[PDB]
Amino acid sequence: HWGYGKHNGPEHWHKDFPIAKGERQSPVDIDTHTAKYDPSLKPLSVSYDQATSLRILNNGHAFNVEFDDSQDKAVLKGGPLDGTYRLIQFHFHWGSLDGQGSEHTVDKKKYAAELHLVHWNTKYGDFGKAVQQPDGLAVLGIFLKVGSAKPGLQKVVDVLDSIKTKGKSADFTNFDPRGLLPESLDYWTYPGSLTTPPLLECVTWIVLKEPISVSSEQVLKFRKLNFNGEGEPEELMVDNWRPAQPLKNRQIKASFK
Numbered sequence: 001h002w003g004y005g006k007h008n009g010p011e012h013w014h015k016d017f018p019i020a021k022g023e024r025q026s027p028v029d030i031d032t033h034t035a036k037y038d039p040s041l042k043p044l045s046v047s048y049d050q051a052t053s054l055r056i057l058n059n060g061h062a063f064n065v066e067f068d069d070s071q072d073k074a075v076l077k078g079g080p081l082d083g084t085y086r087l088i089q090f091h092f093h094w095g096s097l098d099g100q101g102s103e104h105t106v107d108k109k110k111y112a113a114e115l116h117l118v119h120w121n122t123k124y125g126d127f128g129k130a131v132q133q134p135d136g137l138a139v140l141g142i143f144l145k146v147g148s149a150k151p152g153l154q155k156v157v158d159v160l161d162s163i164k165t166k167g168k169s170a171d172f173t174n175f176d177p178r179g180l181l182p183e184s185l186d187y188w189t190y191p192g193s194l195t196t197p198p199l200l201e202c203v204t205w206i207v208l209k210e211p212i213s214v215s216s217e218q219v220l221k222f223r224k225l226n227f228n229g230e231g232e233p234e235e236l237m238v239d240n241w242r243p244a245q246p247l248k249n250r251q252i253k254a255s256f257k
């Protein structure tokens with residue numbers, strides 16, 4: 001029953017998920033002048049050469065491109081991370097118009113959308129165990145700005161017509177998520193949470209500084225999806241972003257000078 005309408009949107013979630021008002025909630029505004037360069041952070045290692053995409057699913061809140069995470073095929077390591085984190089899925093959050101949609105903001109700037117590549121720490125053995133641990137997940141966040149098309153996004157855009165409504169899925173094999181990355185891997189990092197219920201405080205956030213450019217026609221196709229199920233009154237899937245939460249007692253670290 002939570003969602004992104006007036007009646008069940010982010011300002012309501014705390015009633016069922018009281019950790020919504022916790023001490024390490026996400027997303028947050030990244031104040032670029034306050035984030036300190038940490039010459040002790042490593043370069044991220046994004047090792048997607050062996051990624052196995054399987055399926056795309058409209059879950060009623062976003063669409064997820066799911067991967068085979070039963071072995072170490074597509075992993076995130078390095079950066080602020082200890083150990084190895086397996087890619088399980090990616091998804092986006094976006095707006096009704098290009099001036100909003102991202103969950104993190106940069107000096108209060110909102111981007112048209114934000115991609116989240118979700119990985120879990122193999123030392124916990126499965127995703128459901130990893131979300132119960134403060135170092136269980138690593139989510140790589142990438143901003144989308146509207147300009148030139150992103151060629152590696154078009155395969156995702158073109159299948160959306162087949163998963164319009166909640167509970168629909170489609171085969172989605174052989175998709176290479178390296179085509180969704182920007183040139184640079186410079187990033188900010190901080191400890192946070194899932195941004196959807198149950199809002200668990202289990203995420204090391206790694207947010208890339210360089211946005212990727214996507215076309216207006218590409219993000220318009222995201223906005224044709226539906227929150228509702230088949231044959232239900234149409235509620236366009238737009239504005240499925242949680243706003244910035246209080247930073248509290250946390251420090252955002254930059255990987256770059």
Ligand SMILES: NS(=O)(=O)c1ccco1
Nearest residue numbers: 001002008012013015016
């Ligand atoms: N807390 S919640 O967002 O799941 C909800 C259910 C009904 C109203 O608010």
Ligand SMILES: NS(=O)(=O)c1ccco1
Nearest residue numbers: 116118139193194195196
């Ligand atoms: N949006 S996100 O990447 O923090 C996420 C993954 C699973 C639940 O919430």
Ligand SMILES: [Zn+2]
Nearest residue numbers: 091093116195
């Ligand atoms: Zn997300």
